[PDB]
């Protein structure tokens, strides 16, 4: 089981191993796992159901193993392939933007996304 759900998507709302980037570093959830609530940081995500693996680039969210073995993952918008060169150019501009201008934090988050993008 697993629920990978979003407002405008319900990707994986069975699933066996899910690999997630979380405030606790990187976390893997496999079968029974302890019942947790962890906010997912902005992420590169792999979801594996059997050996088959599907790769998502994810806006962070919250992750919750439920005690009924329902891995509720909720995030705003995801496919990794859709997200990912032109974006790297835009993000470079955004890196410049942090210099000039809450906006500092916003642009800082954009730089974080650039790092995550570089990971892709």
């Amino acid at each position: 089981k697993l629920q990978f759900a979003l407002p405008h998507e319900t990707l994986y709302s069975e699933v066996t191993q899910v690999n997630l980037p979380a405030k606790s570093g990187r976390i893997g959830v496999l079968a029974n796992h302890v019942p947790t609530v962890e906010q997912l940081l902005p992420g590169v995500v792999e979801v594996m159901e059997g050996s088959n693996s599907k790769k998502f680039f994810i806006s962070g969210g919250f992750a919750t193993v439920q005690p009924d073995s329902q891995l509720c993952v909720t995030a705003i918008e995801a496919p990794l392939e859709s997200f990912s060169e032109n974006i790297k150019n835009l993000l470079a501009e955004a890196k410049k933007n942090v210099s000039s201008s809450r906006e500092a934090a916003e642009a800082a988050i954009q730089v974080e996304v650039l790092e995550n993008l570089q990971s892709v």
Partner: protein, 48 residues
């Protein structure tokens, strides 16, 4: 500023390679003005 505001900015960043669709673009562009009201009284409809 909120944790979910951070996530919001991230979602907007995520709609940036070029393989995008209108509904995505629409989900990251919206127009609104938060009219901070007051006790009748009401600071202006300052853009959200």
């Amino acid at each position: 500023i909120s944790y979910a505001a951070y996530l919001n900015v991230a979602a907007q960043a995520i709609r940036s390679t070029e393989l995008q669709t209108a509904s995505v673009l629409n989900r990251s562009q919206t127009d609104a003005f938060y009219t901070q009201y007051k006790n009748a009284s009401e600071p202006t409809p300052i853009t959200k």
